């Protein structure tokens, strides 16, 4: 019911917006009536469609059993089996909640073609949401790569000055790396004749073949989180992509890599994952430490936030490769907490400052608290969330991820605690400068945060603190789903 | 596969046309008028010149009717051929085939007919024409010879089936039937 | 001497000289067919040889017409 | 079932110089245009020809 | 079978509707074009369903032989 | 039907007077002939009956269910191509009159269709040589149909010379085999498959590789496709590959009987080089047809990996890939022919000269297509994304099915190289999309009355005048939606490819 309704309804929504806005192309040269107020009616229809998608997952959430082991809502549609568990359910809801936020963040800061942008946003959201409910490797890859087509055009049309560089980077870094993941999927379909999740989870392959399959998949996953040294696409893509593209990229697209570990590595390549964990920890720890020190020297506001996202997703990778429930739950909570804080920091840095001054150079901004006090409150509040200050979901995710690493590997997992210091070094260096000293001589006094931008900031802050104070809303759903990923034989 | 009884692995041209069903003639007419009709439809779909409908000239309709006439016959020829091959339902054609062969056998005449061709040319002609209908859409080739390579055993005509008792055909042995291989090489083994 | 492509020096420096090389190369195939067919006392090889000769003559005419029209295109002003 | 069905269809049985498919239905040389009886080296008896290898139709 | 042919006709409606955008005409221009397009793909859809129904019958017959072939191998 | 109707059309064309309308109506008669040919062929040839393989015409030809599918594909694609010369592509006489000025255009196509369909059926070395000449000669005559064009004639000269060298190589290979065995029929030669020199068949494949533009012989095809008129380049770049690749598959099916791994290595060397040239070759080019020539070289390398592996998974891969690639090839060239109507007109640096044969010659002539026609621009984006291999488009399943067959046979290197080749070629595929759309916002509010389309008049100023003709628009709409929505019927289509057998049986 879920997948069938989520696809059929959105196709009707896509066709409806095309029919209304393209009925007058034929040398009418008219003035229409939907083109008024920057295509307000067409924007409103797409905004409504995004909210309705959140209602569809809710109807299937009411019947979700947290005390059932296995996939639920098992459905067949387009010759593909679709199912949900505790892990998938939360990631689907996170993906769909950000849909309205992506549209509303670009409500009035596009030069034109609002119908195209709204369709692409709703198209990106559904394809990413469907990626959490597929039940085979090939369906995972189809949805993993289908987002590249709209994302490539979204950046190149609505992007910043270096959009051409950013569009090529996202298309080539992600497509080339995922084709290595396709090689591993083809091998599974050749030797086992199926790519079904449950079917492949029960098969033990030779330790040499598991190594080759792990490397193929990890290449696709490592580029998309991203990890060092294949991370160089992300800062360029984030600084040039539109605000809605940055929100979806920083809120959902990066979380597909962690879900890739949960599906494509842990239950099917269990023996070889234990072998690779020290290598994963070394790569991730250096990803965390290097990205934090590199973030210090950055001079672009939207690139600083982009490098901040890489540091925290290294911690998510460390937690998910811990072989205990504490690390796995911590990595998942950190994924959800990051899914709200990171888009909020892009709205503050690339959606409020950029929409007023159209410059992302750090040297132009200081003392903003004198004439933008409301902006400074949200900037300061989200900065402490971004560094894992307690009472925030980020801390609960970070503390359990660090604890899970220590339990997994006491010696090298202890280096993960540098996230506490290093994240505060670069994040509070930027915030201390935007809110420090006299109001900048290079800026003219203008409006403070508007009602729309207050609304976006409030509804990204609220879930972060609710999860931070009472994470059992999330841990109860994840408890039985996460316990299946642990591999150990104690005697 | 819904296979049927094999009647003739290489039916003669005259037999294929004679065994046309009334639908085969109907499709022959449809092909003949389907070609001028498609020229009208293509003009209706999109006029050749400008934006208004114009009937194609009579000379185009003349050559179109000829093209459709040949196309209609080729379709009907392949429709009737499948019944001989057993690919298509051929219950009516089996009853008609059995009557004609038994009638000719009782007259001590070849069911295939006498040929101007020597033994080599009858064999060669069958090699050239057998299964040639599979490429009748590309280029034509027909069995217009009285050869004996038809993929059937004439002994199956010596058992009376349901609905054949009233025919009262007295069939002689195969060595008395004129112009058959089993009754031809009497004095020499390399000359008929 | 063949492996260093000595035949590339024996071909003349006109487009028509390439045509002659093609005819000679194909004629080598037919001589090999006639030689094998005669030794085997096989008429199927000689039928093949006859087919090669007729077909090789067809492409000689088709190629010549292309070269004929190519030369006409250059002499196109034709103010006379 | 889907995994089982693909395993049957995608399996390629081995071919070597001892087993493969040759599409020849009859022995040649029963008749020649002239001089069918040559050096009497044709030792194949077409009156008592053993049954040929009929091809397999998987859909039958 | 109506449900299958209903979708094929709806595919034909989409084909015509997409064509109107290519030619830059209102989607209400010449409404008979949707009826023509819908029937043309119902006809293709009906032939397509016969093709797939035939394929499943042929596949079963071939699979039976393939299973016997595999049983001999697994020994 | 083809042969009979060709003779009537040959005579009829020479009888009536010469006018553009009459040639256009004669082209429509050619459309009816191919349709009747398809209906007659479908009425008599069925996959279930031809599975065994049936000999025709004294065993000179051999049709099976693998050959039959390609014949129907050739007829279907030839139907789509004739719609280009039988209907208006743009609607403006200065561009469309070219397709109606040659009365022998349809005659040559019918000549070549006969050669295309018979070539996969060849069962004798004598008829293999005859048919490969029949197909080649018609291609030369089609390349030179516009004999008043300097580039068209120059291409036909290059085509004739290179294709004659390949034919001699093909003839030389068959003569060597006849010399070894004294036999001409393929099935008779199969009885001695273990004793003839198998590399005598590699020489036969080498001549076939030249005719499909494989590396290192890729240079002439890239040159010819760029110099020929866009209507000619559409046909000659696709049609020879449908038949020759099918014949190569059948030849490689016989070669795999003896399992000569040295022969497998030489072919793998040619595939490896062609991937490198196909991907890196297109990176620095400015012509769209030169870019598509390298795309053709790259997609042929992908199919040849499936042909080289030559297993049960290879039949499904090759059959599906060739069908979906033909439709993508047809769709792209249809759009390129249409979108010449949006070309700006002067009223200058680099002295760029554009001719009537190829109005769209450079990649940057596709600029602002997202503004001029959004539906067509999206249709072109969908096709280009399919060539890239973006799921769930048809091009994704083509690469997926090719990889399955290649990796199942142990071709680890070629599977990795093609996936690297796919990433490299994505750079120049994306450049098309960058030209189409990336400057939309910085150019949306501009006054463009200098287009070719603006030269057309208006009927009444109260009617609605479609900007693109009916037939060409419906074909682009149909093919684009098939490419986009193949996920709906992918399971049923791939089950059909399971039934296409090449002496599998059991
Ligand atoms: C029969 C007469 C005929 O062919 O039509 C008259 C036709 C038109 O003559 P016309 O006086 O110039 O008509 C003025 C218009 O141009 C003619 O315009 P039109 O459109 O009226 O004629 C074009 C004609 C198209 O005519 C053809 O396609 C010729 C078919 C032959 C192949 O279309 C038809 O009318 C089709 C029916 C007539 C041809 C039927 C042929 C059946 C196949 C035999 O004349 C010919 O085409 C003669 C060609 C054959 C010459 C004889 C060849 C000898 C071969 C055997 C030699 C040994 C014996
Ligand atoms: C890319 C290039 C590709 C190549 C394209 C070129 C196309 C070539 C394909 C053309 C055919 C290929 C074969 C050529 C070699 C033919 C040599 C040959 O067969 O000589 C033996 C044959 C005599 O050998 P036979 O074993 O004694 O057979 C006697 C009858 O022919 C057979 O017995 P019957 O029952 O037919 O009795 C004959 C009598 C039967 O008339 C009666 O007494 C009434 C019986 C019922 C008939 C009612 C239905 C008639 C249909 C209307 O009247 C007929 O049925 C005349 C037969 C011809 C019918 C029309 C031919 C269709 C051509 C299209 O010589 C012929 O007379 C053949 C018929 C005339 C030649 C047709 C030329 C077509 C062009
Ligand atoms: C009007 C009547 C509509 C046709 C009714 C029908 O039967 O359509 C078939 C299908 C319904 O589903 P059904 O076959 O009953 O069983 C589920 C398996 N798909 O319904 C469908 O197949 C609809 C499929 C079209 C919508 C999906 C198109 C692709 C969307 C992009 C792919 C997204 C995933 C990647
Ligand atoms: C902002 C900074 C935030 C924090 C940054 C990270 C700081 C933590 C990095 C160090 C990791 C925590 C250290 C914990 C190790 C101490 C555990 C211990 O008890 O030591 C002994 C232990 C084994 O116990 P024992 O019984 O004595 O050995 C004999 C066994 N029959 O094991 C041993 O024998 C000793 C193991 C070697 C310890 C190496 C410590 C150096 C690590 C350097 C890292 C690179 C610099
Ligand atoms: C800037 C953004 C704006 C938002 C900022 C403020 C965010 C809202 C603050 C609250 C956060 C939401 C978390 C509370 C939601 C309710 C959680 C809950 O369900 O409590 C259940 C608890 C035990 O559950 P049970 O025994 O099973 O009985 C209930 C059966 N349904 O049953 C109970 O006993 C309920 C007890 C609830 C106590 C009140 C909780 C409010 C927070 C105060 C405590 C916070 C922790 C103390 C921290 C102080 C600083 C160290
Ligand atoms: C037999 C071959 C000759 C038959 C030709 C008979 C014919 O075509 O009908 C004549 C008719 C001409 O009428 P029309 O030209 O409009 O009036 C004179 C204007 N000055 O022509 C027409 O209007 C076309 C009507 C259909 C013609 C069918 C002819 C088919 C030719 C025979 C095919 C089978 C052999
Ligand atoms: C077409 C007409 C063919 C029918 C015909 O007129 O002649 C057929 C006739 C065969 O009949 P018959 O004389 O009884 O042969 C004795 C068999 N032992 O005798 C013949 O076979 C004569 C050969 C007929 C060839 C007629 C000319 C062919 C047309 C070429 C164009
Ligand atoms: C005209 C289109 C007619 C489609 C007919 C396709 C066809 O040839 O039949 C399916 C064929 C299997 O056929 P078979 O089983 O051997 O014979 C009996 C089947 N009736 O299976 C095949 O092998 C067909 C292989 C080629 C398939 C090509 C698919 C073409 C897609 C549609 C073309 C686009 C239509 C654009 C519309 C423009 C016209 C306005
Ligand atoms: C969930 C599966 C959905 C699949 C269908 C995709 C949408 C089809 C759109 C066709 C109609 C059209 O081209 O219409 C154009 C519309 C709206 O443009 P507009 O602003 O009104 O145009 C301007 C007109 N003015 C000037 C009058 C205002 O653009 C879209 O819709 C864009 C969506 C597709 C972008 C991504 C392409 C990726 C291709 C490969 C995908 C894997
Ligand atoms: C401007 C618009 C932008 C895009 C909007 C998208 C609209 C989508 C409309 C879909 C209509 C629908 O529902 O079609 C559904 C119908 C009926 O399916 P069925 O027979 O029961 O098969 C069961 C389907 N399974 C297997 C999923 C259960 O099948 C069709 O017609 C198929 C669509 C044609 C796709 C092309 C491939 C097939 C041709 C083969 C040639 C090689
Ligand atoms: C048995 C099932 C099929 C039945 C119908 C098929 C033939 C239809 C011909 C009707 C006449 C006609 O096409 O008339 C021409 C019309 C209108 O053209 P327009 O662009 O609006 O020109 C403007 C016309 N004014 C000026 C008069 C307003 O074109 C159409 O409507 C195009 C629809 C074509 C459908 C093609 C279906 C292809 C399916 C392919 C599957 C593989």
Author numbering:
A (entry chain M): 1 to 491
B (entry chain O): 1 to 192
C (entry chain K): 1 to 80
D (entry chain h): 123 to 182
E (entry chain d): 1 to 75
F (entry chain N): 1 to 347, 365 to 523
What text appears in the publication on this structure?
Mitochondrial NADH [reduced form of NAD+ (nicotinamide adenine dinucleotide)]:ubiquinone oxidoreductase [complex I (CI)] is a large multisubunit enzyme located in the inner mitochondrial membrane where, together with the other electron transport chain complexes, it maintains the proton-motive force and the NADH/NAD+ redox balance that are required for adenosine 5′-triphosphate generation and a host of metabolic processes (1–3). The process catalyzed by CI comprises a redox reaction coupled to proton translocation across the inner mitochondrial membrane. In the hydrophilic domain, two electrons are passed from NADH to ubiquinone [typically ubiquinone-10 (Q10)] via a flavin mononucleotide (FMN) and an extended chain of iron-sulfur (FeS) clusters, forming ubiquinol, which is reoxidized to sustain the electron transport chain and reduce O2 to H2O. Here, we report the structure of isolated CI from the yeast Pichia pastoris (Pp-CI) and identify distinct closed and open states that resemble those of mammalian CI.
